[PDB]
Amino acid sequence: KEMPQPKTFGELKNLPLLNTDKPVQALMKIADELGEIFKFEAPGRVTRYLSSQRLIKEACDESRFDKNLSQALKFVRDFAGDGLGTSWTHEKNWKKAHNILLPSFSQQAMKGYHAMMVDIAVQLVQKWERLNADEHIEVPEDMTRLTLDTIGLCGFNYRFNSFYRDQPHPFITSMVRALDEVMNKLQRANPDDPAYDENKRQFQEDIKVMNDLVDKIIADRKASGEQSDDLLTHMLNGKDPETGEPLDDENIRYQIITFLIAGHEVTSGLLSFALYFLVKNPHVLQKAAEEAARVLVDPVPSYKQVKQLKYVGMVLNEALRLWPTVPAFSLYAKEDTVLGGEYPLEKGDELMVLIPQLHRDKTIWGDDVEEFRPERFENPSAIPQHAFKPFGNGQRACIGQQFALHEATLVLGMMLKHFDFEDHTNYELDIKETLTLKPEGFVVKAKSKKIPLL
Ligand code: HEM
Numbered sequence: 084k085e086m087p088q089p090k091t092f093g094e095l096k097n098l099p100l101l102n103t104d105k106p107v108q109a110l111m112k113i114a115d116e117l118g119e120i121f122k123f124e125a126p127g128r129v130t131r132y133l134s135s136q137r138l139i140k141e142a143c144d145e146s147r148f149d150k151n152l153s154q155a156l157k158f159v160r161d162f163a164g165d166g167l168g169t170s171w172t173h174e175k176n177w178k179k180a181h182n183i184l185l186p187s188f189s190q191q192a193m194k195g196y197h198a199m200m201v202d203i204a205v206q207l208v209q210k211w212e213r214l215n216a217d218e219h220i221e222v223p224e225d226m227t228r229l230t231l232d233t234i235g236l237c238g239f240n241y242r243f244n245s246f247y248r249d250q251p252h253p254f255i256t257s258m259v260r261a262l263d264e265v266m267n268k269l270q271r272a273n274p275d276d277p278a279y280d281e282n283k284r285q286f287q288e289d290i291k292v293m294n295d296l297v298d299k300i301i302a303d304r305k306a307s308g309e310q311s312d313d314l315l316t317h318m319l320n321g322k323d324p325e326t327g328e329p330l331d332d333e334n335i336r337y338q339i340i341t342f343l344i345a346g347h348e349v350t351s352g353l354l355s356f357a358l359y360f361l362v363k364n365p366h367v368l369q370k371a372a373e374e375a376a377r378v379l380v381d382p383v384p385s386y387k388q389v390k391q392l393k394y395v396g397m398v399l400n401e402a403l404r405l406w407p408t409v410p411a412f413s414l415y416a417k418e419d420t421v422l423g424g425e426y427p428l429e430k431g432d433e434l435m436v437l438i439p440q441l442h443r444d445k446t447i448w449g450d451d452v453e454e455f456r457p458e459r460f461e462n463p464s465a466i467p468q469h470a471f472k473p474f475g476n477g478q479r480a481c482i483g484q485q486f487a488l489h490e491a492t493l494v495l496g497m498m499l500k501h502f503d504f505e506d507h508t509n510y511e512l513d514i515k516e517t518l519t520l521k522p523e524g525f526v527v528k529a530k531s532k533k534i535p536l537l
C-alpha cells in the first residue's frame with residue numbers, strides 16, 4: 084500500500100505545515116484526515132507519522148526498531164549533550180548512565196525522595212490556604228513551581244524557592260529560551276537566513292549559562308564533600324557494573340540539565356491537565372476526592388498512602404492518555420522490514436509515534452475516546468499491547484516515570500483532600516505548545532476544607 088501524504092508547498096514539501104502555533108494539534112488533525120500512517124517530507128528529511136495501535140505495536144518491537152533522535156532532540160542535544168534523553172542507544176554513555184541511574188529512579192528510591200516531595204507539596208497547599216476570598220489560582224504556573232522545586236530538591240539538594248518568587252531562576256530563563264529557540268528552529272523554512280544570527284548568538288549564550296551554573300553546582304558538591312541522598316550524590320559515587328566506570332563531570336552536567344527539562348513543564352503539564360479534567364468532570368472529581376479523604380488520614384501523606392491512591396493514579400493515566408506531555412518519539416528501522424504487512428521499510432527509515440493520536444484509537448478504547456474516564460485503567464491486562472505509551476518504549480522508556488507519577492499522585496491527593504475546586508471562568512481549553520503541552524490560562528478557585536497540616 085502507498086501511504087498518504089498531507090498537502091505540499093513545492094520544494095519546501097510539508098515543512099510549512101509545522102510553521103504553526105500548535106504543530107502537534109496540526110499533526111493530529113492530519114492524522115484524522117489521512118489515517119493511521121502518513122508520509123511527512125521536508126528538505127533533506129523523510130519520516131512517517133504513526134497513529135494506530137496496529138502499527139505502533141510493531142514499531143515498539145525493539146528487535147526491529149531503535150530510538151531515533153528527532154530533529155527536536157538533535158537540537159536539544161546541543162545543550163543536553165549525551166545525557167540519557169539525547170544519546171543514541173549505541174553511545175557508550177547511554178548504557179553507562181542507564182545502568183548507574185536505574186537504582187536512583189525505582190520505587191525503592193522513591194521512599195527516599197518522599198520527604199523532600201512532601202516538603203514542596205506542603206508549600207503548594209499552604210499557598211492556596213493563604214489566598215484571599217475571591218482570589219484565584221493560575222494552575223500551570225503553580226504546578227510548574229511545584230515540579231521544578233521538587234526536581235531541584237531531589238535532584239541536587241537545591242531549593243529553587245519558586246513559591247517565593249515571580250521572576251524565574253537565571254538557569255530557567257536560559258533553559259526556556261533555549262527550548263523556545265529549538266521550537267522556532269524546527270519551523271524555519273530557510274534556517275540559514277542571516278535574520279536568525281541574533282537568535283543563534285542568544286542560543287549560544289543560553290547554553291553557556293546553563294553549563295556554567297550546572298558545572299558550579301557539581302564543583303561545589305565535590306568541594307564540600309556532603310553526602311545528600313540525591314541524584315547528584317548517586318552520580319558522583321556510582322559505578323557502571325558493566326564497564327566498572329563512573330560518569331565524568333561533563334556527562335553529569337548533561338544529566339542534570341536533562342532532568343531539569345523533564346521535571347519542569349513536562350511534568351507540571353500532567354498535573355495541570357489532570358486538574359482540568361477533574362473540574363470538567365465533577366463525578367470523577369468527587370470519586371477521587373472520596374479516595375483522598377479515605378486514604379490520607381494523617382496530616383501529611385506517607386509513602387505507603389501515596390501507593391494506595393489507586394483512583395488518583397488512574398486519573399493521572401487518563402490525563403496522560405488524552406494529553407501526553409511528551410507528544411511524540413522517533414524510531415528507526417534496524418533492518419529492512421514490513422509494517423502491518425503493507426508498508427515496506429528499508430534499514431534506516433525513520434518513524435514518528437504521534438502519541439495523542441494513538442491514545443484516540445477507537446478500535447482500542449471504544450467510541451468514547453474523547454471522554455475522561457479513569458476506569459479505563461482499572462486493569463492493565465485489559466489494555467492491548469502498546470496501546471498506551473505516554474512514557475515511551477522499551478529500554479529507551481522514561482527513566483523518570485515512577486518519579487513523575489509519585490510526585491503527581493502525592494500533590495494531587497493532597498489538593499483533593501484539602502480543597503473544593505471551582506471552574507469559576509468556565510475555562511475553554513487552549514493548549515499552548517512548546518516542546519511540551521499545557522492548558523494556557525487555566526484558572527480555578529480553591530475553597531479550603533479547613534483541614535490542618537499539623
Ligand atoms: C509526566 C511526566 C513525563 C513524561 C510524560 C515523560 C515521558 C517520556 C518519554 C515519552 C520519553 C521517551 C522519549 C523518546 O523516546 O525520545 C522519556 C524519556 C526520558 N525521560 Fe521522561 N517523562 C516525564 C517526566 C520525567 C522526569 C520527572 C524525569 C526525570 C526527573 C524524566 C527523565 C527522562 C529520561 C532520562 C529519559 C530518557 C531515558 C533513556 O532514554 O534512557 N522524565 N520520558
Ligand SMILES: O=C(CCCCCn1ccnc1)N[C@@H](Cc1ccccc1)C(=O)O
Binds near residue numbers: 156411435
Ligand atoms: O517530537 C517532538 C519532540 C517532543 C519532545 C521530546 C522531549 N523533550 C521535551 C523537551 N525537550 C525535549 N515534537 C513533534 C511535534 C512538533 C513539531 C514541530 C515543532 C514542535 C513540535 C515533532 O517533532 O514531530
